[PDB]
Design a binder for these strands. Structure first.
Ligand SMILES: [Mg+2]
Ligand SMILES: [Mg+2]
Ligand SMILES: [Mg+2]
Ligand SMILES: [Mg+2]
Ligand SMILES: [Mg+2]
Ligand SMILES: [Mg+2]
Ligand SMILES: [Mg+2]
Ligand SMILES: [Mg+2]
Ligand SMILES: [Mg+2]
Ligand SMILES: [Mg+2]
Ligand SMILES: [Mg+2]
Ligand SMILES: [Mg+2]
Ligand SMILES: [Mg+2]
Ligand SMILES: [Mg+2]
Ligand SMILES: [Mg+2]
Ligand SMILES: [Mg+2]
Ligand SMILES: [Mg+2]
Ligand SMILES: [Mg+2]
Ligand SMILES: [Mg+2]
Lengths: 48, 43, 185, 37
RNA sequence: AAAAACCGUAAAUCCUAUCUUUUAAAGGAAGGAGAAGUCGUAACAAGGUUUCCGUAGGUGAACCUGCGGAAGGAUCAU
RNA sequence: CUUUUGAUGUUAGGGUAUUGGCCUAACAUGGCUAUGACGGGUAACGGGGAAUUAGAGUUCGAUUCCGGAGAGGGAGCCUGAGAAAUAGCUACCACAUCUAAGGAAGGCAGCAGGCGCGUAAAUUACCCAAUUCUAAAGAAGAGAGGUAGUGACAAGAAAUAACAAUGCAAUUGUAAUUGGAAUGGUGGGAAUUUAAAACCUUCCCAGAGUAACAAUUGGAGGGCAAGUCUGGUGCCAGCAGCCGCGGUAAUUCCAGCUCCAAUAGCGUAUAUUAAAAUUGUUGCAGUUAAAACGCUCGUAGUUGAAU
């Protein structure tokens, strides 16, 4: 479990072309920061 | 950047309601129907 | 503490989920004996595999050995009592020739269908589930009941069933009611 | 990376010159670590 | 009975000495990924000076030159 | 490595329930080790056992039984046949309660229950009727133990129709229409069960037709069973474990229809076993794919003609 810190977009690898939607999270357990993918067509605007 | 395009096509597609009832068989009767359709009428 | 009663499984999965020939053969068998899932086929396969494993292990063992004599006589008696071997093939080598249709022929459903007494195998399954069938003065309502040799001549309708000499059901009595008040007024 | 060093089937930079570059770098590192001791 | 002394069994606190784990930082210097960047053309053909090994010097860069070795050579041969 | 401060032995005593460097005095220089001592790590309590495997193996075991250890952390002690006991006592370290401020009381890793921690776990219920234990031993007591409540951890059985007639492509079959039987699920009342608690079983009454008493979760290019069907989007939005799809013809995105798989169950994440003869004793490879030490001698080890 973690608290959302930022929303970002990531490039795809070379032969493909798209902008993938992710969030940056700070973990409650130990305070570390990770990056996580948000699956779904428009699921990013479910997140504040 | 441009992350305001999220959920474009999902909001673009026009909505359509589904069909009415067409209830289906469940369990042993369904297997009976499959057996009859796949084997009985073929010879 | 934890309870001392135990439990075990009865089936197994095919390890290869989309093989065409196995799937067609299973549908053959299901439609022939009127079953519900692949689980019934798999449980019969499990039982047969255990039997065959015991037979193989005994057959490797020395002829005229004590363990062979005791366990082989026990297993052959069990098989002949179940109705799977016969009379002239009790030799511990005819056990390895037992197929799936052999065992799957002893279910109460197949027996009730084959002994007249029901128009179809599906009709047979429906009647068993509605408390219409006895096996020797004991009423049974489970279609996977496997019938033994000395019990196949006592299959019959139940004494508490409208098909075996009792009062009629909830529909006949209501029709007779309504007819009575129609004809008395 | 033993005898398979200097193996050339792909058009890379020559092995002994890369060896020389690494040795120069290591000499610099050793001098700068000694200066703090 | 209270109370003292001594040899023992000894919680605890402090001062030093090592050790293990985690961690801050001016500055220095590697690797991986990306973008249409600037400079040359070292390798692949005898790649236009055949390539490569150990060692030692030098130069913006890839690299060049001396000494000894190999063919995985461009020679199975006078 | 151990040995000034007991490390290895001998002599004499002390002490204990008894043997003993267990302790004290005198004496001697011993003891262990590449067949791994002395150290470090363990997200290590040990077994009986568990999972998966043709045979070998690999990985788990806090947790029903047995053995060990502990009661916030250490040390000391009384009673007693049995304790270094903690719902016994005495101090120190930490934490914390009541107060008239002089003082007095504390230990849920026992059963329930609360906070915190986190991905992660139930009722502040009834009873001594059964199994057993203690006593001044029928008769008292027991959160030992049993009974129920919550509970898709795991395991077993098993509904969601069946039949006939008439039509209809081929005796079938059923995208259909008719019409009567058979049944539980459900509501009420009993016989029972039980410390006249509730399940389960068995009877009586009522009670199915869109039997609305209406099955889901994932998929349809290949691996891998199943659509060259319609509408929208246009390297965007998105999908995809892997190869890949997406610029007007998208079998892969978003929807509708239809099909496929398993089915009261079905997906996702992490770990582990087979697959792996990709750890090889059975049973791998070493010219060029990863890999014969530059060469010889040599101790330990492994292996050695016939009678
Ligand atoms: Mg090689
Ligand atoms: Mg050249
Ligand atoms: Mg002494
Ligand atoms: Mg254990
Ligand atoms: Mg125990
Ligand atoms: Mg505690
Ligand atoms: Mg104590
Ligand atoms: Mg205490
Ligand atoms: Mg307590
Ligand atoms: Mg508790
Ligand atoms: Mg749970
Ligand atoms: Mg009692
Ligand atoms: Mg008395
Ligand atoms: Mg689709
Ligand atoms: Mg494995
Ligand atoms: Mg293996
Ligand atoms: Mg194998
Ligand atoms: Mg190999
Ligand atoms: Mg050599």
């Amino acid at each position: 479990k973690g608290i959302v810190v930022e929303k970002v977009a990531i490039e795809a690898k070379q032969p493909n072309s798209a902008y993938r939607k992710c969030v940056r999270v700070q973990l409650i357990k130990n305070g570390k920061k990770i990056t996580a993918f948000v699956p779904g067509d428009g699921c990013l605007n479910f997140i504040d | 950047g441009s992350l305001a395009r999220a959920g474009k096509v999902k909001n673009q597609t026009p909505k359509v309601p589904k069909l009415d009832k067409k209830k289906r068989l469940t369990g042993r009767a369904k297997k009976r129907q499959l057996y009859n359709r796949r084997f009985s009428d073929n010879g | 503490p934890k309870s001392y009663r135990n439990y075990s499984k009865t089936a197994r999965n095919p390890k290869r989920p989309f093989e065409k020939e196995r799937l067609d053969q299973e549908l053959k068998l299901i439609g022939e004996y009127g079953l519900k899932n692949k689980r019934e086929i798999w449980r019969v396969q499990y039982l047969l595999a255990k039997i065959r494993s015991a037979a193989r292990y005994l057959l490797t063992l020395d002829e005229k050995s004590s363990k062979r004599i005791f366990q082989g006589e026990a297993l052959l008696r069990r098989m002949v009592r179940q109705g799977l071997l016969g009379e002239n093939e009790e030799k511990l080598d005819y056990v390895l020739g037992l197929t799936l249709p052999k065992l799957l022929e002893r279910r109460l459903q197949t027996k009730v269908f084959k002994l007249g007494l029901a128009k179809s195998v599906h009709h047979a399954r429906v009647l068993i589930r509605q408390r219409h069938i006895r096996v020797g003065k004991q009423m049974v309502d489970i279609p996977s009941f496997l019938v033994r040799v000395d019990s196949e001549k006592h299959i019959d309708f139940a004494t508490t069933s409208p098909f075996g000499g009792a009062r009629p059901g909830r529909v006949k009595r209501k029709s007779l009611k309504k007819q009575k008040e129609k004809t008395e007024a | 990376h033993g005898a398979s060093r200097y193996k050339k089937s792909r058009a890379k930079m020559r092995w002994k010159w890369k060896k020389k570059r690494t040795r120069r770098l290591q000499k610099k590192r050793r001098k700068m670590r000694q200066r703090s001791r």
